[PDB]
Structure formats: structure tokens, C-alpha cells
Ligand binder design. Structure first.
Ligand SMILES: C=CCc1ccc(O)c(OC)c1
Length: 119
């Protein structure tokens, strides 16, 4: 996947997931910029939708290190990808919707979805 292809893919998922969840565009823009309101229901649903569509969360809401590696290896150095994988593997949440927003918040510390547009 190229950067330009990832840019297009992120825009597609952001649009599909906004329609599917009913999240307000400004709230979706906050998520894209890495400002995640983890406790907000629509933010949780939007985060879940994006992570599932990128194969980062499986049907059982288990974090898939290979899914995040496939995206992040295009954006950050190899040692930062390994750090992100170990860091975000520590998120343990019985509520799968809260798990999804906590995961997007974790990934956002390394690179935001918005950051890809300036590449
Ligand atoms: C990994 C796919 C979606 C995604 C979620 C949160 C992010 O911060 C991100 O940055 C590139 C990408």
C-alpha cells in the first residue's frame, strides 16, 4: 500500500464509518486529529468501525498486531511500530466499544489519521 493509497483508503473508511455510526462531522474530525473522547458512544462506534475495517480488531474485538503493522509501517520507523504494538496490546477493556476508542487514542499518540494528509 502506498501513502497516496492509504490517504484514499482512510478517507473512504472515515466516510463509510461516519454514515454507519451517525457521528457528527466535527466529532469525527476530532478523532481524525487524535483528540479522542473515549467515553463518547458515537466516538466508540466510529473507532470500532474504522479499526474493524482495517482488520485491526477481529470479530471478537481482539487487537490484531499484523493489521496495525500493515498501516503504521508506512508512517513510522520500525522500532516505533514495535513500541506501539506492545503499548496498545496492554489495553484491556470488558466493554468492546470502550476498547476501540482507547485503542484509537493509543495509536493516535504515534500518528494521527489527519497526519497522513500532509505526507
Ligand atoms: C490503523 C488504521 C486506523 C488509524 C487509527 C488511528 C490512527 O491514529 C491512525 O493513524 C494513522 C490510523
Amino acid at each position: 500500500m502506498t501513502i497516496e493509497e492509504l490517504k484514499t483508503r482512510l478517507h473512504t473508511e472515515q466516510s463509510v464509518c461516519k454514515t454507519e455510526t451517525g457521528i457528527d462531522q466535527q466529532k469525527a474530525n476530532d478523532v481524525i486529529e487524535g483528540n479522542i473522547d473515549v467515553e463518547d458512544k458515537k466516538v466508540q462506534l466510529y473507532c470500532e468501525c474504522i479499526l474493524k475495517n482495517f482488520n485491526i480488531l477481529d470479530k471478537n474485538n481482539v487487537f490484531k498486531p499484523q493489521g496495525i503493522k500493515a498501516v503504521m509501517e508506512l508512517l513510522i520507523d520500525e522500532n516505533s511500530v514495535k513500541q506501539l504494538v506492545s503499548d496498545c496490546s496492554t489495553i484491556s477493556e470488558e466493554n468492546p466499544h470502550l476498547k476501540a476508542s482507547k485503542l484509537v487514542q493509543c495509536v493516535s499518540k504515534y500518528k494521527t489519521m489527519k497526519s497522513v494528509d500532509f505526507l
